[PDB]
């Protein structure tokens, strides 16, 4: 509530790494990389459409999870919840490290292990508290931090004056196999949608504001990306093998003049902590939506949510079991698996806008039937282009979820179609 | 129909590689390997229980797929069908290669590429025809071939006289047994043969649950009374079999001389399981077809199985793997389908709980535990299976889902629907 603070969240929850994204992508060239932002933005825009439409037909508590529930039943709803709930706070631990690693990286306040681990846990509860007492208040905070974090990116254009960069300086491979290696970066840079969908229930004035923020935030972060990754791969820190090594930041203050004292990392650190609260917000939301139904422990619904702390207690437990102990083999990899979890809800939501809203089409049916087919292929490629290892455990999680469900809802479950009786 | 020909199928569809299994497992030792057959047989027996019970409460067309349908709805039923249907015939192409590769390997009739590829396609339709006109006739064939194939294994015990053979890669006893499961967990992908065989099978609700436990307990004895009767003492030490595929090695340290009649029947015990799987292929296809899920053609007039659509595909995917250059990508697929088979296994367990939570006894905790083992069983099997493979199993679910929401858009029955 209302619209303008939400449209910033939908975009903010995407750009928790918009400032650093460029260099990591410049490795696989940056000239024929823009020749790849299309495939990404097109597919990603198709997803923003689906969620925008699905939310206009049903402003839910809600999902995602909600849409999944209706579409496929209780099982896949319950499942959609867990996966997404985990991806929310498990994805948060990597955001504090990098978040704080932007404040104490340029001063440099403090750096050592047991020193940074405490200020992260500290700032975590700093946002866990803002959520448990101010849905409007937390949306204010993010709205503030995301605008600050945008100052640089929006300030970068300001184009003068690009200089023919490496164009296609990526590893020797056909233009097709070259763009494929660029998607491994761009496809995952739009895991910010559905922020309004689950934000519904709150958000207020939904059915309109949500679908608007869903397309707004995306079209905002879509411009930022292609009007930032271009305004740097030409001409500030070229050639490719100049940024390909060092993390961007102070490199934007030489080839057009800013001096420094770099005030860049001072706000690009808030644009990572501002997205902290937003995700914990969603965490408790999907948890409540589920809790309010026969699926997922009741405590997560108790006026915002009181069990918002169970997320905080866990985020801290999984903060210590990754920083202090040396390995870390498990804490380290788990943080990347949760990212794939986020793709399962994305999937079903599409299947939902079809299976459910096959009536409210227009019938501009083929047009809708196609947009959902793109968003489908989008999510599919994202998965494929993601090192085997990671995916393997996403699967094993489904494996567990399933068993975990049939062992907790044994009799509470409503079977279609049931047995006979004798 | 009736029982005795089916109990042999449930076991036959497990031992399509029971004769070769030993050596591949001897690599990771064979002494502390028996100290691993327990974990396997226990978990695998737990699965045979679930299916035996689930089928006694509902003799279905059927699944698996069927149980999955009731349990979770139409979507997961439809999905359970595809995955299992594919795993049936995609798993068949590797059975003809190895099957024929047991006849023309010891004579040796013929060996070359475009020569073996033709006799496989030939023997494929040889079983595709036996199925499209004789469910009893095909069960006769397998019943015959599986008994023949058992002659060696059952004849191996005959124990005299074992000789003291953990020679696996340096690793704690726990990490040593884990590497043994990568062989044993997957050696029991033969269950649920009777469950899907229901509808046919006749006299079900009893015969099926009996064959489900019978076949397993039969192939469970064969394994542990064969892998032991060889890792002691015929071809030891470990690094004697660890290199060469067993077969003629069982005719020196106790047995008769040349002319090995072993590979002559152990080739039929691989072709006899050919028809059985195509049988199930058309069965799960029909069961699904007979419901709103899966193309209608797979259910027709003739009182048996569109059983040819499977044959047409098995041939297309036979050529696109032997004659053609590449040629590896379409070879990985043959191993992915194996994991597909684990998804039905999963839901079936979830079913015997979610559905049959009444007919328990209530010996509830006892049932509630058996299903928990079979659960963990299927879970480990998946984990202990090189990332790559699993990744594409997931991508298949990805596709299946989209494939469904794009074909049953309006036919789908939504719980709970929208509004106005």
């Amino acid at each position, epitope marked *: 509530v209302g619209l303008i603070p939400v449209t910033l969240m939908v975009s903010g929850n995407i750009m928790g790494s918009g400032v650093f994204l460029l260099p990591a992508n410049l490795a696989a060239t940056g000239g024929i990389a823009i020749y790849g932002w299309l495939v990404t933005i097109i597919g990603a825009l198709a997803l923003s459409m689906v969620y925008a439409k699905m939310s206009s037909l049903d402003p839910s508590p809600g999902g995602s999870y909600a849409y999944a529930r209706r579409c496929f039943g209780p099982f896949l709803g319950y499942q959609t919840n867990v996966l997404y709930w985990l991806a929310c706070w498990i994805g948060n631990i990597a955001m504090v490290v990098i978040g704080v690693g932007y404040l104490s990286y340029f001063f440099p306040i403090l750096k050592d292990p047991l020193v940074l681990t405490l200020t992260c846990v500290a700032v975590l509860w700093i946002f866990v508290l803002l959520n448990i007492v101010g849905p409007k208040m937390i949306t204010r905070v993010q709205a503030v931090a995301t605008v600050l974090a945008l100052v640089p990116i929006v300030g970068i254009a300001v184009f003068g004056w690009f200089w023919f960069k490496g164009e296609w300086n990526v590893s020797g491979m056909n233009t097709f196999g070259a763009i494929q290696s660029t998607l491994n970066v761009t496809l995952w840079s739009f895991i910010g949608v559905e922020s309004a969908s689950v934000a519904a229930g709150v958000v207020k004035n939904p059915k309109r504001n949500v679908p608007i923020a869903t397309i707004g935030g995306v079209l905002i972060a879509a411009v930022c990306y292609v009007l930032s990754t271009t305004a740097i791969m030409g001409m500030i820190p070229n050639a490719a093998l100049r940024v390909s090594a060092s993390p961007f930041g102070d490199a934007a203050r030489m080839a057009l003049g800013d001096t420094a004292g770099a005030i860049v990392s001072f706000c690009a650190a808030a644009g990572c902590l501002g997205s902290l609260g937003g995700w914990t917000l969603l965490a408790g939301q999907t948890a409540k939506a589920a809790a309010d139904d026969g699926l997922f422990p009741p405590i997560f619904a108790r006026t915002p949510v009181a069990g918002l702390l169970i997320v905080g207690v866990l985020m801290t437990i999984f903060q210590f079991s990754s920083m202090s102990p040396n390995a870390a083999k498990e804490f380290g990899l788990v943080s990347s698996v949760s990212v794939i979890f986020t793709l399962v809800p994305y999937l079903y939501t599409c299947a939902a806008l079809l299976l459910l809203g096959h009536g409210h089409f227009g019938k501009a049916r083929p047009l809708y039937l196609l947009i959902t087919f793109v968003a489908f292929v989008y999510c599919i490629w994202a998965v494929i282009g993601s090192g085997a290892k990671e995916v393997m455990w996403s699967f094993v999680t489904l494996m567990v979820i399933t068993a975990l469900y049939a062992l907790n809802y044994n009799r509470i479950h409503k079977n279609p179609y049931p047995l006979d009786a004798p | 129909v009736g029982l005795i020909p089916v109990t042999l199928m449930v076991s036959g569809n497990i031992m399509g590689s029971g004769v070769f299994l030993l050596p591949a497992n001897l690599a990771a030792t064979g002494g502390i390997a028996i100290y691993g057959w327990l974990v396997t047989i226990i978990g695998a027996l737990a699965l045979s229980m679930v299916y035996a019970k689930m089928s006694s409460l509902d003799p279905s067309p059927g699944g698996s797929y069927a149980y999955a349908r009731r349990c979770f709805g139409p979507f997961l039923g439809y999905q359970t069908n595809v995955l299992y249907w594919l795993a049936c015939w995609i798993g068949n192409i590797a059975m003809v290669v190895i099957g024929v590769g047991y006849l023309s390997y010891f004579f040796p009739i013929l060996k070359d590429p475009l020569v073996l590829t033709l006799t496989c396609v030939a023997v494929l339709w040889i079983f595709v025809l036996l199925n499209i006109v004789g469910p009893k006739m095909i069960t006769r064939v397998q019943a015959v071939a599986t008994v023949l194939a058992l002659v060696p294994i059952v004849g191996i015990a005959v124990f005299g006289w074992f000789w003291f053979k953990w020679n696996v890669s340096g690793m704690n006893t726990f990490g040593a047994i884990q590497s043994t499961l990568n062989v044993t967990l997957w050696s029991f992908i033969g269950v649920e043969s009777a469950s899907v065989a229901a509808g046919v099978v006749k006299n079900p609700k009893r015969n099926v649950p009996i064959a489900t436990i019978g076949g397993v307990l039969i192939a469970a004895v064969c394994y542990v009374l064969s892998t032991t009767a060889i890792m002691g003492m015929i071809p030891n030490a470990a690094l004697r079999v660890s290199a060469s595929p067993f077969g003629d090695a069982a005719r020196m340290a106790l047995g008769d001389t040349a002319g090995a009649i072993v590979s002559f029947c152990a080739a039929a015990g691989c072709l006899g399981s050919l028809g059985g799987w195509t049988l199930l292929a058309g069965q799960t296809a029909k069961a699904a077809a007979d419901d709103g899920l899966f193309p209608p053609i797979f259910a027709r007039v003739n009182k048996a199985g569109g059983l040819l659509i499977v044959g047409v595909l098995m041939t297309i995917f036979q050529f696109s793997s032997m004659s053609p250059n590449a040629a590896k990508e379409f070879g990985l697929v043959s191993s992915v389908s194996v994991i597909f088979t684990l998804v039905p296994y999963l839901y079936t367990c979830a079913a015997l709980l979610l559905l049959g939570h009444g007919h328990f006894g209530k010996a509830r905790p006892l049932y509630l535990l058996i299903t928990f083992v079979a659960f963990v069983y299927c879970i480990w099997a998946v984990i202990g299976s090189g990332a790559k493979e699993v990744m594409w199993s997931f991508v298949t679910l990805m596709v299946i889902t989209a494939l469904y929401a794009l074909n049953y858009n309006r036919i789908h*029955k939504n719980p709970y*629907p929208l509004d106005a």
Partner: antibody
Amino acid sequence: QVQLQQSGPELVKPGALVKISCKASGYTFTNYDINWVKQRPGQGLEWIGWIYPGDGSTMYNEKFKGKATLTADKSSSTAYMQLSSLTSENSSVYFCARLDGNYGGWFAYWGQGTSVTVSS
Amino acid sequence: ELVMTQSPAIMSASPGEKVTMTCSASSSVNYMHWYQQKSGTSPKRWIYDTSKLASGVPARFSGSGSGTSYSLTISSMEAEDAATYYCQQWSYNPPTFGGGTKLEIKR
């Protein structure tokens, strides 16, 4: 609001068959099932079967045959025949009913009821 | 073939009195449903998922139970409450209803 209302008639002669209708409105006819229950003279109600306007249908075992549930998507209603009626099988007002979902398991909307006498 | 056999068959109560009708069950089920049929007319949804109140149903009503024993109750009786209440299940096949409990007002 769901309406789901039916027809008042009619009397029947033993042996002959009847065809009762239930025209639904207020919701999309093809999103849910359509159920039928048979309530003897101020007595217990007996489920009969459902029918999916989408396609197929399930029928109560006891009343094997003796009735065929049909439907037309167009008219947004659903027919229902009683095959081999007999003097005693006389309604027992017949009700059409739609669940609130679907799947499982309680009827949220009932037809007004159709009284059926089968005498000569 | 899952019998409902609910009792009492017929009962009467004065306005303000606590009414309690039960519903046995052949074998254990999860969830039971109650409908309120007045004078032969089309039944009305009242108690779904064992303890859920329908749209209009007044707070005065309430349901409970599990396994084989379920029961519908009302704190204070009312003239309106007079009717026949039907317990019903869908936990197995086919779905079935009870004999009905006939509640009459006392005057």
